[PDB]
Amino acid sequence: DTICVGYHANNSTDTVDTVLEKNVTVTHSVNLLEDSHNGKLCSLNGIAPLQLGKCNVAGWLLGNPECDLLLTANSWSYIIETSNSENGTCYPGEFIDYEELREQLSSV
Amino acid sequence: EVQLLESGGGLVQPGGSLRLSCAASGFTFSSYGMAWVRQAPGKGLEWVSFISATGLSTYFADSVKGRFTISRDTTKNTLYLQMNSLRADDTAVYFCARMRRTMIAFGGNDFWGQGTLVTVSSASTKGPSVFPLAPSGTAALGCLVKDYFPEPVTVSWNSGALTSGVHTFPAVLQSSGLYSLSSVVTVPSSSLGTQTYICNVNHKPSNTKVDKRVEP
Amino acid sequence: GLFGAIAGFIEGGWTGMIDGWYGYHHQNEQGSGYAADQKSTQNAIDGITSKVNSVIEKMNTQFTAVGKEFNNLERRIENLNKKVDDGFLDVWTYNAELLVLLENERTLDFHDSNVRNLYEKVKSQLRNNAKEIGNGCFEFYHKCDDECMESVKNGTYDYPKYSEESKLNREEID
Amino acid sequence: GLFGAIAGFIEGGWTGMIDGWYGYHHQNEQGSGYAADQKSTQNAIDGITSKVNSVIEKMNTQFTAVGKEFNNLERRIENLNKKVDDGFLDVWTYNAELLVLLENERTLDFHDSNVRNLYEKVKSQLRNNAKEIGNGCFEFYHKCDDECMESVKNGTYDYPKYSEESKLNREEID
Amino acid sequence: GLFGAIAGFIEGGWTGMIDGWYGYHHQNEQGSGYAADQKSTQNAIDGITSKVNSVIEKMNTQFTAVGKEFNNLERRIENLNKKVDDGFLDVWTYNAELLVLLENERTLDFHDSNVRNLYEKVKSQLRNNAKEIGNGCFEFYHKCDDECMESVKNGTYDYPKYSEESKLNREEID
Amino acid sequence: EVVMTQSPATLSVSPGEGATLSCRASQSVNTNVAWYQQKPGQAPRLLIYGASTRATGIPARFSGSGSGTEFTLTISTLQSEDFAVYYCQQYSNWPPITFGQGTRLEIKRTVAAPSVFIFPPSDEQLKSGTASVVCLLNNFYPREAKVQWKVDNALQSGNSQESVTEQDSKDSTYSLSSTLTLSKADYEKHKVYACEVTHQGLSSPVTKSFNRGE
Ligand SMILES: *[C@@H]1O[C@H](CO)[C@@H](O[C@@H]2O[C@H](CO)[C@@H](O[C@@H]3O[C@H](CO[C@H]4O[C@H](CO)[C@@H](O)[C@H](O)[C@@H]4O)[C@@H](O)[C@H](O[C@H]4O[C@H](CO)[C@@H](O)[C@H](O)[C@@H]4O)[C@@H]3O)[C@H](O)[C@H]2NC(C)=O)[C@H](O)[C@H]1NC(C)=O
Ligand SMILES: *[C@@H]1O[C@H](CO[C@@H]2O[C@@H](C)[C@@H](O)[C@@H](O)[C@@H]2O)[C@@H](O[C@@H]2O[C@H](CO)[C@@H](O[C@@H]3O[C@H](CO)[C@@H](O)[C@H](O)[C@@H]3O)[C@H](O)[C@H]2NC(C)=O)[C@H](O)[C@H]1NC(C)=O
Ligand SMILES: *[C@@H]1O[C@H](CO)[C@@H](O[C@@H]2O[C@H](CO)[C@@H](O[C@@H]3O[C@H](CO)[C@@H](O)[C@H](O)[C@@H]3O)[C@H](O)[C@H]2NC(C)=O)[C@H](O)[C@H]1NC(C)=O
Ligand SMILES: *[C@@H]1O[C@H](CO)[C@@H](O[C@@H]2O[C@H](CO)[C@@H](O[C@@H]3O[C@H](CO)[C@@H](O)[C@H](O)[C@@H]3O)[C@H](O)[C@H]2NC(C)=O)[C@H](O)[C@H]1NC(C)=O
Ligand SMILES: *[C@@H]1O[C@H](CO)[C@@H](O[C@@H]2O[C@H](CO)[C@@H](O[C@@H]3O[C@H](CO)[C@@H](O)[C@H](O)[C@@H]3O)[C@H](O)[C@H]2NC(C)=O)[C@H](O)[C@H]1NC(C)=O
Ligand SMILES: *[C@@H]1O[C@H](CO)[C@@H](O[C@@H]2O[C@H](CO)[C@@H](O)[C@H](O)[C@H]2NC(C)=O)[C@H](O)[C@H]1NC(C)=O
């Protein structure tokens, strides 16, 4: 009649890198790195964002007449531009200190 | 090459004692566990006993507790099993077998002996009696062998000149404590004219030869 | 370093053992084994849980980080901004990978140490009456049942109960 | 990992021992013990002193760091400045806390290793005439006085002086 | 921690041994020794090679980094630029020195562990017929030739071949 | 005690086919099952251990499968030497080591009718006081046959013994004998005796009959 002393084994296949060795098969492990995301743009804490659509920030503040849809908007969580936001300044010229205005605008 | 020879069988009176021995040759004997497994006639296998490699662990079957001991000798490379105070239902063929590994999960018994026979009963060595088995209107005839204790008998026909339709049934223990079998031959129905049959029965333990002709 | 137990003097693990990490395997008069050792495995679970929670709570979450804009006469500041972002990103990715690589040898050696200590304890409370035979097994010159099995497991063996009788059997084999 | 001595096979520490970290406790014909082992404890003090001085001298002192000022049209640069300061502060606080947390397991295992080695040495130079009894104690089949006590302590035991006489007493108890 | 073998219970190294890191020294009937142990030293070489390559490949190369220019009314941005460069330089020099200092104790303890395990293996496969004598040497009550030397080296000793004969000689000396 | 059970009891098969055998445990053994075959009057031999790994020197047509509580032996092809008896063994929780109950393996051929004969005793048995009457079946397939022993159209019990031969290498059909063994008194008492046979190959149960002293 005997006692033997041993340890647990399993059928897991997940591997762990280490310094002295690569691809070590471990019994239990835990991930620490997120990869998955939806393809959506939801609202921060129950307040909808503000989508400029085909309009620029300059076009929105000046009131570029083709940006007529977003005329009644007054609250948001964050502002969304697209890759087709081109309607900015219809009469040609130069909005002076446009970037400083975009930095002031990110706290309102 | 590994072989296991074994001896110590024979007919023994009820309440007696034996000492079977299994001699091993072909491996290091002091590094494998050993086991004894018996088989009743016309039944399945049954485990009897086990001794470990170092000889510090012995286990027995539950039905044979206290009546059986087991030991090993390294110098002779010999396994001994001592049987005490037997019963009628210990009549079996005994095998010595070897554990494949040395752990608890040993993984089957790879090498086996060849079987020694042990019969425990209370009877005398008695010669058999032969009776002819006669055709009324049929095409078969035979000889009936009755009331012999030890195994085996041998029944031949025409001193080996009859090897067609010869059926010799396996012996059966009758309730008195003896054995009885039969031997039959089918021939043509009309072969009762000139044809002569002689059944030749040989009983090697009691050494009795009986010659019997069968006819109506 | 490697303490020598896991894939060392002890061979591979036990699939048949379920409810723990470190356990026993016994073969007394009426059964086979696979019982776990709930004392040591609980200490291992506590240590590992505290380790993972510590590694989580050292890393602060980040708040909002949005890109900036520059015209064609502020190239210099724009390059400075890009340099700052890339520098901090390289520092954090280095810290993350290096922390995981060192922590893995630490945890594997921790398990190895636990197995070695669990073997040394059983050896130490079976000083004379055992005759160890290989890959962490013992063999009881005296006779043992379920009660002395649990007596070994808990850590209460009371050796002088058996010390004479074992001695007899030892002198039988010698 | 844990070497198994401190709060392991040896029980709790000795309050009565003062002048060291690792020591002995002897009971010959005319006294009790508590003498320290000045050889090994000096190596421990040297190692720990070098460790603390290394950790101090890796951290450079900082020179003058005074805040800057910006008007209302330089918000962009001001946010960049704040980002740089907060980033470097997070990096240094991470490094400090992580360094202390790893260094603590290193030093506790260092002490544990020292106790185990100090036990193995005494066992190795008392091969036959000892009969160890539990939690790191030995028991001298032969007879010992203060001189053989110091003879054990220094590491000069000369076993063949006693090897026969012990043998006699051993065969008395067996 | 220190496993106790190198400059421990084993004395200094062997200059006469060439083709490895861990080896044997045998004195049978017809020769002296110094043969290496090619199994364990290969595992040590693999571990150390992977370690050095990992430390190399964690450090990314840098691309072009050229200084910038500022006039006398951009002192503020210039000081910010200098602060960024000096901060990142301090962080990287800290990481480099600290990584090397910890890696060195790791590798020395790794070698120490290998020597201790290589000793324990040889002890474990020579359970009764050895009589160890000091600083890792054994002494064969039975008689050994080159074949049982290699039989020890590989890890295939088959103890029950000699177990009786040794016993005789042991009882001769006792 | 882990109790093993094999299924089915007897498997009949034609050559050039495979076969499947089931061993079932009362508890959960992990993978610690082995199988053995046994020829008549031979020692057993190890086939397959650990339920997956074939033994050394085993042809590759044998296969073993299963885990948990049910296990399966599978044979691909036969060459007329594999007709033997098969046993399963657990070694997960011993003592006591427990074997199965065996499953013999038979050759399958065309169903044939039994030839039924009878034999009244000889008079020297009554001179000794013995009555040995022999009812006989020769050359029949399959195994299962039914013998009914009647005295003046009334069923007997407890006074009959039976025996069965092996499976012959040529015709693969069986042979059965049954024997009435009594004293002088019954064979002198009644007159008309019979044995009636019911078999699968038989269209009708066949009666063989005799008189007292005939
Ligand atoms: C919101 O944003 C949209 C998209 O940017 C603006 O719509 C664009 O308006 C500009 C200016 O009117 C267009 O650019 C010019 O279009 C002229 C007409 O092109 C014809 O052929 C094209 C074929 O693809 C058609 O798409 C188009 O409908 C016309 O039929 C071009 O001729 C111009 O080319 C150049 O040559 C002429 C030569 O005289 C010069 O005058 C020009 O300066 C230039 O060098 C030029 O391409 C642009 O095509 C429009 N895009 C779309 C998608 O409609 C909206 O105007 C803007 N909102 C406001 C308030 O204006
Ligand atoms: C650690 O293991 C991973 C995964 O490989 C798995 O484990 C191995 C030990 C083997 O058992 C594999 O059969 C098993 O899947 C290795 O990752 C990748 O290995 C492959 C080679 O198997 C590398 O070659 C690539 O293969 C892919 C196709 O799968 C091609 O598209 C590539 O062009 C290239 O040929 C591959 O680079 C490597 N990485 C990835 C992400 O696939 C891994 O290499 C191994 N660790 C070591 C020692 O590097
Ligand atoms: C560790 O194991 C020991 C066993 O050595 C445990 O002590 C045991 O407690 C059990 C409780 O079931 C005792 O069994 C029963 O005790 C009752 C009450 O006396 C009795 O009526 C039953 O017939 C049976 O004996 C057992 O006897 C006792 N140990 C002894 C001396 O045999 C212990 O509780 C376990 N835990 C620890 C930390 O010790
Ligand atoms: C370690 O311990 C040994 C003791 O085994 C020390 O050696 C000893 O040195 C002392 C000095 O007091 C000796 O005691 C005295 O020696 C003088 C001079 O011979 C003598 O006149 C006294 O009567 C007394 O014996 C002691 O005898 C000697 N060891 C022996 C052989 O007994 C040693 O110095 C200590 N240090 C080291 C590193 O060894
Ligand atoms: C480890 O060492 C063992 C030695 O115990 C090696 O096995 C040995 O292989 C050598 C090959 O030279 C055998 O020597 C010779 O074998 C031939 C062929 O039988 C024979 O004709 C020669 O006279 C001589 O015996 C040696 O006998 C054999 N071991 C034994 C049983 O003595 C083994 O290969 C080495 N490697 C490993 C991993 O085992
Ligand atoms: C490894 O073993 C585990 C069981 O320990 C397997 O898990 C089983 O998976 C199947 C299918 O998902 C479930 O029906 C069972 O309930 C699971 N078992 C238990 C007890 O939970 C696992 O599938 C095995 N191997 C892998 C990785 O597939």
Tab-separated table of C-alpha atoms in Angstrom, chain D residues 35-172:
chain	number	residue	atom	x	y	z
D	35	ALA	CA	24.819	31.799	19.533
D	36	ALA	CA	24.736	33.492	16.110
D	37	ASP	CA	26.547	32.435	12.944
D	38	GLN	CA	28.689	35.445	12.071
D	39	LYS	CA	29.957	34.032	8.754
D	40	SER	CA	26.710	33.743	6.783
D	41	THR	CA	24.942	36.776	8.269
D	42	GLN	CA	27.834	38.979	7.130
D	43	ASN	CA	27.339	37.805	3.534
D	44	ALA	CA	23.623	38.568	3.871
D	45	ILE	CA	24.373	42.079	5.191
D	46	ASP	CA	26.825	42.711	2.323
D	47	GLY	CA	24.312	41.557	-0.319
D	48	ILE	CA	21.428	43.607	1.050
D	49	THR	CA	23.579	46.731	1.508
D	50	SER	CA	24.811	46.529	-2.101
D	51	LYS	CA	21.210	45.986	-3.281
D	52	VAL	CA	19.841	49.085	-1.536
D	53	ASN	CA	22.749	51.264	-2.685
D	54	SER	CA	22.274	50.062	-6.282
D	55	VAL	CA	18.548	50.907	-6.199
D	56	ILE	CA	19.381	54.376	-4.806
D	57	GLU	CA	22.096	55.147	-7.364
D	58	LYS	CA	20.041	54.138	-10.422
D	59	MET	CA	17.601	56.997	-9.772
D	60	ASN	CA	18.933	60.366	-10.891
D	61	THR	CA	17.945	63.522	-9.054
D	62	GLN	CA	15.922	66.121	-10.932
D	63	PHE	CA	16.927	69.744	-11.403
D	64	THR	CA	14.698	72.823	-11.626
D	65	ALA	CA	11.294	72.288	-13.225
D	66	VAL	CA	9.090	75.377	-13.285
D	67	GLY	CA	5.705	75.763	-15.006
D	68	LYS	CA	5.253	77.834	-18.148
D	69	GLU	CA	2.695	80.402	-19.281
D	70	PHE	CA	0.522	80.678	-22.382
D	71	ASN	CA	-2.068	83.146	-23.668
D	72	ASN	CA	-5.498	82.298	-25.085
D	73	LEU	CA	-4.291	81.595	-28.657
D	74	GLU	CA	-1.714	78.972	-27.667
D	75	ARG	CA	-4.102	76.376	-26.254
D	76	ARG	CA	-2.676	73.721	-28.567
D	77	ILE	CA	0.906	73.969	-27.287
D	78	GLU	CA	-0.394	74.182	-23.699
D	79	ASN	CA	-2.240	70.873	-24.053
D	80	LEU	CA	0.934	69.352	-25.571
D	81	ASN	CA	2.959	70.536	-22.556
D	82	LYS	CA	0.460	69.065	-20.089
D	83	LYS	CA	0.493	65.774	-22.029
D	84	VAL	CA	4.305	65.551	-21.785
D	85	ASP	CA	4.355	66.195	-18.023
D	86	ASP	CA	1.583	63.714	-17.232
D	87	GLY	CA	3.122	61.020	-19.460
D	88	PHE	CA	6.533	61.173	-17.810
D	89	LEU	CA	4.971	61.244	-14.338
D	90	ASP	CA	2.952	58.083	-15.080
D	91	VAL	CA	6.036	56.292	-16.431
D	92	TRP	CA	8.143	57.070	-13.354
D	93	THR	CA	5.457	56.162	-10.816
D	94	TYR	CA	4.942	52.837	-12.624
D	95	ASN	CA	8.680	52.077	-12.579
D	96	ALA	CA	9.025	52.906	-8.863
D	97	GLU	CA	6.106	50.771	-7.643
D	98	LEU	CA	6.941	47.801	-9.895
D	99	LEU	CA	10.636	47.832	-8.856
D	100	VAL	CA	9.752	47.712	-5.146
D	101	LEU	CA	7.160	44.919	-5.619
D	102	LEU	CA	9.595	42.628	-7.429
D	103	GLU	CA	12.541	43.403	-5.163
D	104	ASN	CA	10.543	42.310	-2.100
D	105	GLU	CA	10.001	38.712	-3.280
D	106	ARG	CA	13.641	38.611	-4.309
D	107	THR	CA	14.869	39.559	-0.818
D	108	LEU	CA	12.486	37.253	1.090
D	109	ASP	CA	13.505	34.275	-1.044
D	110	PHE	CA	17.139	35.264	-0.485
D	111	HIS	CA	16.731	34.910	3.295
D	112	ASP	CA	14.858	31.632	2.850
D	113	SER	CA	17.696	30.229	0.716
D	114	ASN	CA	20.259	31.233	3.347
D	115	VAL	CA	18.427	29.336	6.089
D	116	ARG	CA	18.101	26.203	3.937
D	117	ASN	CA	21.796	26.204	3.009
D	118	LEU	CA	22.831	26.747	6.646
D	119	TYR	CA	20.777	23.668	7.545
D	120	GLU	CA	22.198	21.504	4.723
D	121	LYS	CA	25.795	22.323	5.740
D	122	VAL	CA	25.295	21.123	9.320
D	123	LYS	CA	23.540	17.977	8.066
D	124	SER	CA	26.364	17.253	5.605
D	125	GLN	CA	29.153	17.448	8.199
D	126	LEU	CA	27.238	15.154	10.614
D	127	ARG	CA	26.604	12.264	8.173
D	128	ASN	CA	26.105	9.265	10.509
D	129	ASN	CA	26.330	10.428	14.173
D	130	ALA	CA	23.334	12.823	14.447
D	131	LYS	CA	19.798	11.315	14.203
D	132	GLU	CA	17.831	14.396	13.167
D	133	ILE	CA	14.532	14.567	15.042
D	134	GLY	CA	12.463	17.394	13.528
D	135	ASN	CA	12.251	21.148	12.757
D	136	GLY	CA	16.021	21.313	12.292
D	137	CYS	CA	17.505	19.676	15.376
D	138	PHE	CA	20.126	16.962	15.752
D	139	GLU	CA	21.015	14.760	18.581
D	140	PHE	CA	24.644	13.486	18.794
D	141	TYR	CA	24.864	9.783	19.600
D	142	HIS	CA	28.218	10.452	20.987
D	143	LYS	CA	28.917	12.931	23.775
D	144	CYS	CA	29.691	16.568	22.974
D	145	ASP	CA	31.072	19.513	24.938
D	146	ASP	CA	31.719	23.182	24.079
D	147	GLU	CA	34.751	22.368	21.898
D	148	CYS	CA	32.849	20.071	19.539
D	149	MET	CA	30.078	22.715	19.529
D	150	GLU	CA	32.500	25.318	18.151
D	151	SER	CA	33.919	22.544	15.941
D	152	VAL	CA	30.469	22.196	14.367
D	153	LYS	CA	29.982	25.986	14.162
D	154	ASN	CA	33.242	26.831	12.319
D	155	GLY	CA	32.883	23.948	9.863
D	156	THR	CA	35.688	21.768	11.148
D	157	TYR	CA	34.071	18.703	12.700
D	158	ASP	CA	36.635	15.844	12.076
D	159	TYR	CA	33.996	13.054	12.110
D	160	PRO	CA	36.524	10.139	12.226
D	161	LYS	CA	37.465	11.157	15.774
D	162	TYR	CA	34.043	10.015	17.007
D	163	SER	CA	32.910	7.606	14.265
D	164	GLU	CA	33.458	4.383	16.203
D	165	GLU	CA	32.047	5.444	19.555
D	166	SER	CA	28.776	6.806	18.156
D	167	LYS	CA	28.432	3.499	16.278
D	168	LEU	CA	28.385	1.622	19.608
D	169	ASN	CA	25.575	3.802	20.998
D	170	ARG	CA	23.636	3.521	17.745
D	171	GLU	CA	23.703	-0.260	18.008
D	172	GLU	CA	22.567	0.124	21.604
